[PDB]
Design a protein around this ligand. Structure first.
Ligand code: HEM
Length: 153
């Protein structure tokens, strides 16, 4: 469980994200594909993009990134009370996209890297600790939902 203080640190840095959701979304997706190239294989609509600049120029990748962060932001703002928001994401990610929890770990590492890169003064040790805990909670709870659906990834 996160404390109220941890939640507040999460939401404080999240507000910075919300100043430029698109740009954050692009940077996180790009970082994910650079750090863990196998994750790109899971995206039929993006895996033809061959360079960082093609990734940055893709409207579809940018639109997707905004969809992803909007969903994550809505989750985070529930401070752990996120069943209603998490369920549909679990459904799709288990049954259609087939995303293993290890790939969620990779995505979480990309989130932390971008936030630190763009907001180091508002993303020191305690903030990073808090966001890692929020993301860990998300991964824990999605995994349980995955299993309820019969998916063991
Ligand atoms: C914090 C982690 C993540 C969040 C919040 C998230 C969120 C979303 C949302 C909101 C959508 C659109 C609705 C849906 O299909 O459920 C989506 C689609 C998708 N997600 Fe994720 N996602 C996450 C992680 C991942 C990871 C790590 C991968 C792959 C390695 C992945 C692969 C996909 C794919 C392939 C789609 C369909 C994209 C399309 O063609 O339109 N997701 N995701």
């Amino acid at each position: 469980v996160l404390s109220e203080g941890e939640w507040q640190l999460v939401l404080h840095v999240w507000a910075k994200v919300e100043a430029d959701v698109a740009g954050h979304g692009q940077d996180i997706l790009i970082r994910l594909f650079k750090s863990h190239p196998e994750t790109l294989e899971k995206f039929d609509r993006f895996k033809h993009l061959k360079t960082e600049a093609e990734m940055k120029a893709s409207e579809d990748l940018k639109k997707h990134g905004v969809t992803v962060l909007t969903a994550l932001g809505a989750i985070l703002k529930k401070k752990g009370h996120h069943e209603a928001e998490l369920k549909p994401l679990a459904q799709s990610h288990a049954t259609k996209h087939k995303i293993p929890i290890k790939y969620l770990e990779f995505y979480s590492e990309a989130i932390i890297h971008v936030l630190h890169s763009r907001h180091p003064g508002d993303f020191g040790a305690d903030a990073q600790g808090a966001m890692n805990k929020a993301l860990e909670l998300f991964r824990k709870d999605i995994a349980a939902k995955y299993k309820e659906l019969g998916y063991q990834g």
